[PDB]
Amino acid sequence: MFVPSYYREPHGSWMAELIRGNPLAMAVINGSTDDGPFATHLPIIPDPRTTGEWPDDLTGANLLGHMNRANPQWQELETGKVILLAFTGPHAYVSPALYGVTPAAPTWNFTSVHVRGVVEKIESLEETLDVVRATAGSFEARFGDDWDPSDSIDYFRKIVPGVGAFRVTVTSAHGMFKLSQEQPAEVRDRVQKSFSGRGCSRHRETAELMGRVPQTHHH
């Protein structure tokens, strides 16, 4: 991932936070020269084993995902293949009108974590079930409404033969936190102020992240 130094994650935990808050990744592997790469949007969770052995920069951590086994990308997920998982968080277009500075150019503030690693296909029926149930339980607790899977565990087992589950061992993770760090403090405050007053949560989230980046040229 190409990241100018002033847009790198302010601390490694920001990557963890973004991955956990936006776990529907784009999973990308090389394809043929004529087809281009494969890409599938699919849910990713940290492997619960990694919680007790957490690496600061996520290197060597294990993530889990699944996809449809009818999806052509599944046939290509050979164990040992390199994979990219791209997670995106809040973002918003920045009008130069908020800068109060001339000259200037517009830009887009945005947040992204690119994780690279090696795929291992999961074939076991029980381990596949462990993946989808841990994904269901983690997402429901974080984003849901106290739904109880207990009456649907047998339902999961009925449909689990269709699941293509896989593990990613992380070889690198990098954050792009493009939040006006190139601008003077007075200029970032003006954008952040304008973004807070929008009321559209995505703008508010972007403003909150820009406020937590310490004082550190793009465009």
Chain positions contacting a second copy, by CB under 8 A: 1-2, 4, 24, 26, 28-31, 33-37, 39-41, 43, 68, 70-73, 82-84, 86, 88, 91, 93, 95-98, 102-106, 108, 110, 112, 114, 116, 132, 136, 139-140, 143-147, 149, 151-152, 154-156, 159, 176, 199-202, 219
Instruction: Choose between 6 and 156: whose C-beta lies nearer to a second copy.
Output: 156
Rounding to the nearest 10 degrees, give the CA dihedral for residues 147, 148, 149, 152: -100
Closest by alpha carbon to 64, among 7, 124, 132?
132
**How many alpha carbons lie under 13 Å from residue 25 in its C-beta half-sphere?**
26
Q: Which residues are paired to 41 by β-bridges?
A: 26
Does residue 106 belong to the site contacting ligand HEM (CB under 6 A)?
yes
- Core vs surface per residue 83-109: b (16+ CB within 10 A) or e: bbbbbbbbbbebebebbeeeebeebeb
Residues of span 114-173 touching ligand HEM by CB under 6 A: 132-133, 135-136, 139, 156, 159-160, 162-163
Instruction: Choose between 94 and 215: whose C-beta lies nearer to a second copy.
Output: 94
The amino acid that residue 142 corresponds to is: R
Q: 160 contacts which partner out of a second copy, ligand HEM, none, CB within 5 to 8 A by kind?
A: ligand HEM
Collect all residues with Cβ–Cβ distance below 8 Å to 123 and sequence separation of at least 6.
none
Spatial contact of 170 and 61, defined as CB atoms under 8 Å apart? yes
Does residue 40 belong to the site contacting ligand HEM (CB under 6 A)?
yes
Residues that bind ligand HEM (CB under 6 A): 2, 40-43, 66-68, 71, 105-108, 132-133, 135-136, 139, 156, 159-160, 162-163, 218-219
